[PDB]
Nucleic acid binder design. Structure first.
Ligand SMILES: [Mg+2]
Ligand SMILES: [Mg+2]
Ligand SMILES: [Mg+2]
Ligand SMILES: [Mg+2]
Length: 754
DNA sequence: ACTGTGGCCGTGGTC
DNA sequence: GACCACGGCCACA
């Protein structure tokens, strides 16, 4: 199994290293014969000699074209003759590529900015993370001594914690009597102890959380201060800082630094991304947070240091658990993209798509088109630009959707930049409305690879059902799901402004075909099957037979699938997603349906909005049940009049009136002072410490004037000298919760209260 | 350019 | 009345 590749330099020449793990053994393969290159397209094939003589300067040396060779690659669908230019060293290219491009006889240059070690992976057809190899993993965290006004890492590192399958431990230079704590003399001997542990365990993977920006940079600054060779690399090197945009990232040679933060940040969407919040979201169990000022106070007074020891241990432990949870998916992703786990764990699929396409382009000898320049990226920028669902309560609803609508469209009509308006074909498909014509004589680049992807995904869903190993099944699943994402990302790439295979005509052709096939499918189910489509968005629809039992709907639906799938061209295929006993649809992307087993599902309808109070969420839930499990609209509206009256009589437990709002920043950085902010500023003066991330649990008291002036914290609430604002919780919590739901039923806000 | 972007919204509060 | 800061949805894996 290939972990990664880099290169070093021996006497000015590049030496590819290939870090590998085979049969549980770590190996470094050296390749001293791989040559950097890029392509050039010339006005006349005779001007090659003058191009060979183009020189530049890097450092105190002359940059020369080592050698050239004439090759034939596909470009815009047809074979072309281009000159493959070779050089001595990777770093030669950025110094001479502009001189070759500025040459008059050179029309353009291609594939000139490919990182040398990633180029090696593609040309040699190597795939990271492929094989059986069980990777050894170890996670680690640090706890430091902060003081406001100090430079970064000016204070020492207090504790270092690690965690693996053998447990979680902490190393520190103050005596803490706990069985998972090892005590050393100094911060120096602590960092040295950590280095020994890592060398001893020899992990393939080091897992951090924000290690790219905090942990390694702190360990670095302390190691330079204390003169420690922080030789975490398997080749004796120190961790290496790479800059990815304004972002910083850290690699450890021979291992994989898996920083969880960039992976979590694009897989789940949370208000803030603390380790504790992420562990909560992923595993449901809580994690206590000890703050910088608390850790500093504890270290200085020696009090409650065991609490900081447990927090350090927990940081490591949950980071190892998060690592075991999220690495296999990312490993499958890198195997699919054909790039390193280090790389794919730090980039969005919209950008990983180009690496996948670029590998496909090499596999099929297709000259990759260049990324756009500034003027071109300007012309590609275009401004952002469906019938409202049917009102009422609907019963016996089925949802039918298209299997990979946009990918199937690309494959069925051979949509691709290299097929758009290709002259001299005998068969074209014409896109509705936008009129673009795509050749059908030869398969296109994008459709051909999208076909292999969709076919692969189908094979893997079959092998999934024929696998008893739950580990193997889970990895197959990850692969199948990522394929679906990658195919859609390939469609999206065709519309991306910075995309190499950009093609606006291809993209708007695909949406045009999508609208045509969707409206067609709806017209067929209503006209020839008596269905009524209730709701539709892009690639699926809800529908039922008006006035029909459940079985008649389900059976007649499966018949429509046989009918429409036969009528549909090519890879266009409709499928059956689910049945729903009842459901109502408010507006686009806002609806509620109930599964026969009772499980209710909702689209953006607010149900966990923490912005809201328990009294409002409760009423919303009860209204949904009376609407979907009971079908009584009047029972729902009765519930609303019951709760609004119970609030007005001060008969609702104040505990259900607490509004939990998160403070996002420092109070000094708040321009508009809202109700939770006004409580936070009031608490800060009384002596409390508020900080970015604190939660304010407040209640609104009865009064005129600003809401913030009547808001007190709930632990400050006394039911005998405080009266809550019943009108506020009626008109601005419960009624706004249920108004949009019951406006689709013709009930106006004035019909829901007292 | 996922300690960022894009789209839709709403509300508390100056001025 | 007019406008803004600041949050909540849905995407971006
Ligand atoms: Mg290029
Ligand atoms: Mg720690
Ligand atoms: Mg760092
Ligand atoms: Mg190539």
């Amino acid at each position: 199994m290939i972990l990664d590749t880099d290169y070093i330099t021996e006497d000015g020449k590049p030496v590819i290293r290939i870090f590998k793990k085979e049969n549980g053994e770590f190996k470094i393969e050296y390749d001293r014969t791989f040559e950097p290159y890029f392509y050039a397209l010339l006005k006349d094939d005779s001007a090659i000699e003058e191009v060979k003589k183009i020189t530049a300067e890097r450092h105190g040396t002359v940059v020369t074209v080592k050698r050239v060779e004439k090759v034939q690659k596909k470009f815009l669908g047809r074979p072309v003759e281009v000159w493959k230019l070779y050089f001595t060293h990777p770093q030669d290219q950025p110094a001479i590529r502009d001189k070759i491009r500025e040459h008059p006889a050179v029309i353009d240059i291609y594939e000139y900015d490919t990182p040398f070690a990633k180029r090696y992976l593609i040309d040699k057809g190597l795939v990271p993370m492929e094989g059986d190899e069980e990777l050894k993993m170890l996670a680690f965290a640090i706890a430091t001594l902060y003081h406001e006004g100090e430079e970064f890492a000016e204070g020492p590192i207090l504790m270092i914690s690690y965690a693996d399958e053998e447990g979680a431990r902490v190393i520190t230079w103050k005596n803490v009597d706990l069985p998972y704590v090892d005590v050393v003399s100094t911060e120096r001997e602590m960092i040295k102890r950590f280095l020994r542990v890592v060398k001893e365990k020899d992990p393939d993977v080091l897992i951090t959380y924000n290690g790219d920006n905090f942990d390694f940079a702190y360990l670095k600054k302390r190691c330079e201060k204390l003169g420690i060779n922080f030789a975490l690399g398997r080749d004796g090197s120190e961790p290496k800082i790479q800059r990815m945009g304004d972002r910083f990232a850290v690699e450890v040679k021979g291992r994989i630094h898996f920083d969880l933060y960039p992976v979590i940040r694009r897989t789940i969407n949370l208000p803030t991304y603390t380790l504790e919040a992420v562990y909560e979201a992923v595993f449901g169990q809580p994690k206590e947070k000890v703050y910088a000022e608390e850790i500093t106070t504890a270290w200085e007074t020696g009090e409650n240091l065991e609490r900081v020891a447990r927090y350090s241990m927990e940081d490591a432990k949950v980071t190892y658990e998060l690592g075991k949870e999220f690495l296999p998916m990312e490993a499958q992703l890198s195997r699919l993209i054909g790039q390193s786990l280090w790389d794919v764990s730090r980039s969005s699929t919209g950008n990983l798509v180009e690496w996948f396409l670029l590998r496909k382009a090499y596999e099929r000898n297709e000259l990759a088109p260049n990324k756009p320049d500034e003027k071109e990226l300007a012309r590609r920028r275009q401004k952002y630009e469906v019938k409202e669902p049917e009102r009422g309560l609907w019963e016996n609803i089925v949802y039918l959707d298209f299997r990979s609508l946009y990918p199937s469209i690309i494959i069925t009509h051979n949509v691709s930049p290299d097929t758009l308006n290709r002259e001299g074909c005998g068969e074209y498909d014409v896109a509705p409305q936008v009129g673009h014509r795509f050749c059908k004589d030869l398969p296109g680049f994008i459709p051909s690879l999208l076909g292999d992807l969709l076919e692969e995904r189908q094979k893997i869903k079959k092998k999934m059902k024929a696998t008893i190993d739950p580990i193997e099944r889970k990895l197959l699943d990850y692969r199948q799901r990522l394929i679906k994402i990658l195919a859609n990302s390939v469609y999206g790439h065709m519309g991306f402004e910075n995309a190499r295979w950009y093609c606006k005509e291809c993209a708007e052709s695909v949406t045009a075909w999508g609208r045509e096939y969707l409206t067609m499918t709806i017209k067929e189910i209503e006209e020839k099957y008596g269905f009524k489509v209730i709701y539709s968005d892009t690639d699926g629809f809800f529908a039922t037979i008006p006035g029909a039992d459940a079985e008649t709907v389900k059976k007649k639906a499966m018949e429509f699938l046989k009918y429409i799938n036969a009528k549909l061209p090519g890879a266009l295929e409709l499928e059956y997603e689910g049945f729903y006993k009842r459901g109502f649809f408010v507006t686009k992307k806002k609806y509620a349906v109930i599964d026969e087993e009772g499980k209710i599902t909702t689209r953006g309808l607010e149900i966990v909005r923490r912005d809201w109070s328990e009294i409002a969420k409760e009423t919303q839930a009860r209204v949904l049940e009376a609407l979907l499990k009971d079908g009584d609209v009047e029972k729902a509206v009765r519930i609303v009049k019951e709760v609004t009256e119970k609030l007005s009589k001060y008969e609702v437990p104040p505990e259900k009136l607490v509004i939990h709002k998160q403070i996002t920043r420092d109070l000094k950085d708040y321009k508009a002072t809202g109700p939770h902010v006004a409580v936070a500023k009031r608490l800060a003066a009384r002596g409390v410490k508020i900080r970015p991330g604190t939660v304010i649990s407040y209640i609104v008291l009865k009064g005129s004037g600003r809401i913030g002036d009547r808001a007190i914290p709930f632990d400050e609430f006394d039911p005998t000298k405080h009266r809550y604002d019943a009108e506020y919780y009626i008109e601005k919590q419960v009624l706004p919760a249920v108004e949009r739901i019951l406006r689709a039923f013709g009930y106006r806000k004035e019909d829901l209260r007292y």
